[PDB]
UniProtKB/Swiss-Prot annotation, chain A:
Subcellular location per the Swiss-Prot or TrEMBL entry: Virion
Keyword set, alphabetical order: Capsid protein, Intermediate capsid protein, Virion
Function: Located at the interface of the incomplete T=13 outer capsid and the pseudo T=2 inner capsid, 120 VP6 subunits clamp and stabilizes the inner capsid shell.
Family from the record: Belongs to the reoviridae clamp protein family.
Gene: S8
Binding partners and assembly: Interacts with capsid proteins VP3, VP5 and VP7.
InterPro entries: Sigma_1_2_reovir
Disulfide links within the chain: none
Entries under Gene3D superfamilies matching the protein: 1.10.287.1520
GO cellular component: viral intermediate capsid
Any Pfam family matching the protein: Sigma_1_2
Protein name as annotated: Clamp protein VP6
From Swiss-Prot, chain B:
Similarity section: Belongs to the turreted BTV-fold inner capsid family.
Subunit architecture: Homodecamer; each decamer is made up of two conformers of VP2, called VP2A and VP2B. 12 homodecamers assemble to form an icosahedral capsid. Interacts with VP6.
Compartments (UniProt record): Virion
Full-protein interval shown: 325 to 373 of 1214
Taxonomic placement: Viruses, Riboviria, Orthornavirae, Duplornaviricota, Resentoviricetes
Domain of life: Viruses
Record-given protein name: Inner capsid protein VP3
Length: 411, 49
């Protein structure tokens, strides 16, 4: 199993302190006052399809964002090698089971406030000793890092080998027929969460393919007329249940393997993701794979924000540096619709209607978020939602390159 | 095979001997014994954590 990890904390958007309050620290959905393995606790039991959000957690991404900010204040052991306290709260034990008020016996030193501190598990030797019980820290820290590096949307990884899907993985995949993406993400999160796993594992490679397949269907390159290995994702009309994409197996044609190995990093370049479940689900699922196996290679700095330029174990500009692509959902949907009519699944009249429906749907997302931002100004003290500008909803980004990659990926 | 994990077969235990050929094989020299001597221990029982 992977015995070392690296990470990076969040960046204060000009504010002087991490953006959370004690109540946020008090109302986590999991076990009391523990951040680990909690990113899905708020929807383990569900009814209906309506997104879950509340007054002080007003977006589907809000809870996870808060958690990331929260962790940024207490991860000192992986930077300074010691446990510290902030505003009179610290960990119960060196195993970091949960947070608690500081005891009045041996108060640990007060944490010095800073941002974007690089992290290395080797600074804290006890983690190696207690790996069997501290394993979930590995997954969560990696998740936090993968979000901290971006100013606009979480970063995640894609790859497809030259060989066909190995038989062992196919045996596992049939267990996940007809399950929506969100459920799959929750399952993927739990798998890499509880116990340490080897990078070489049937389950790991299974999820890796799942990530690739979903992206291929996302562009519409994969559909019921062109499957990966019989697998593909089925979509509902965006006018209603716009997110209930599920996995299907089919007996039809299969896309041929790529000429060479393909791999890249992906990102959403528009604020839409903060209130769109499928982006969160896809990002987390891919990130879960990278968590257990580590980063295949450094990320290209060229398109990243300022604080992300040249992170020690994360970003670079040398030779073995995988580029990162980013896209906007609206043009992506248009391309997906275009693929469908080209493959003949739909007629052009339907394609025009689908674009109108989706654009209207996306408009509500923007309208909701922009109204929600002013209701929770970042200067208040906590950041339930990430700041943005109105123009960010119109950026096309590298969407053209994205669909080009998928076409080169599944062929 | 010490350290591996194997199933129980509580309903009728005689299946236990059949389920995992090779484990605890006598070093006698018989045709089946000679064959079973070539089994690889890592492929007994479950494979994953």
């Amino acid at each position: 199993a992977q015995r070392q990890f690296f990470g990076l904390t969040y960046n204060f958007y000009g504010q002087p302190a991490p953006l959370f309050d004690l109540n946020d620290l008090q109302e986590l959905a999991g076990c009391y006052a523990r951040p680990w393995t909690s990113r899905f606790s708020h929807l383990a039991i569900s009814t209906g399809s309506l997104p879950v959000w509340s007054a002080r957690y007003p977006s589907v991404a809000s809870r996870n964002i808060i958690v990331n900010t929260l962790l940024g204040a207490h991860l000192n052991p992986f930077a300074g090698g010691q446990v510290t306290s902030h505003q009179g709260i610290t960990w119960r034990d060196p195993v970091l089971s949960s947070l608690a008020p500081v005891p009045a016996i041996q108060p640990p030193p007060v944490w010095a406030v800073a941002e974007n501190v690089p992290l290395d598990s080797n600074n804290y030797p006890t983690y190696v000793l207690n790996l069997s019980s501290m394993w979930p820290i590995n997954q969560d820290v990696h998740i936090m890092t993968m979000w901290a590096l971006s100013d606009q949307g979480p970063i995640y990884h894609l790859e497809v080998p030259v060989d066909p899907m190995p038989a062992a993985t196919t045996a596992a995949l049939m267990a996940y027929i007809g399950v929506p993406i969100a459920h799959l993400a929750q399952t993927a999160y739990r798998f890499a969460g509880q116990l340490p796993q080897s990078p070489d594992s049937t389950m790991v490679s299974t999820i890796r393919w799942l990530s690739a397949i979903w992206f291929g269907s996302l562009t519409g390159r994969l559909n019921r007329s062109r499957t990966c290995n019989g697998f593909y994702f089925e979509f509902a009309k965006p006018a209603l249940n716009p997110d209930q994409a599920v996995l299907k197996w089919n007996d039809g044609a299969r896309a041929a393997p790529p000429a060479a190995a393909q791999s890249s990093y992906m990102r959403c370049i528009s604020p839409h993701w903060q209130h769109q479940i499928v982006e969160v689900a896809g990002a987390l699922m891919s990130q879960s794979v990278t968590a257990v196996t580590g980063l295949p290679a450094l990320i290209d700095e060229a398109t990243l924000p300022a604080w992300s330029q040249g992170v020690a174990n994360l970003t670079g500009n040398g030779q073995g540096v995988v580029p990162c692509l980013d896209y906007n959902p609206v043009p992506m949907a248009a391309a997906r619709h275009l693929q469908w009519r080209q493959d003949g699944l739909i007629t052009a009249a339907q394609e025009a209607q689908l674009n109108n429906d989706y654009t209207a749907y996306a408009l509500t997302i923007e309208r909701h978020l922009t109204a929600m931002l002013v209701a929770n100004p970042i200067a208040a003290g906590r950041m339930p939602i990430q700041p943005f500008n109105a123009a960010d909803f119109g950026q096309a980004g590298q969407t053209a390159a994205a669909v080009a990659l998928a076409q080169a990926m599944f062929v | 095979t010490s350290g591996r994990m194997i199933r129980a077969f509580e309903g009728r235990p005689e299946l236990l001997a059949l389920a995992y050929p090779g484990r605890a094989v006598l070093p006698t020299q018989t045709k089946n014994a000679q064959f079973l001597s070539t089994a690889i221990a890592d492929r007994i029982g479950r494979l994953d954590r």
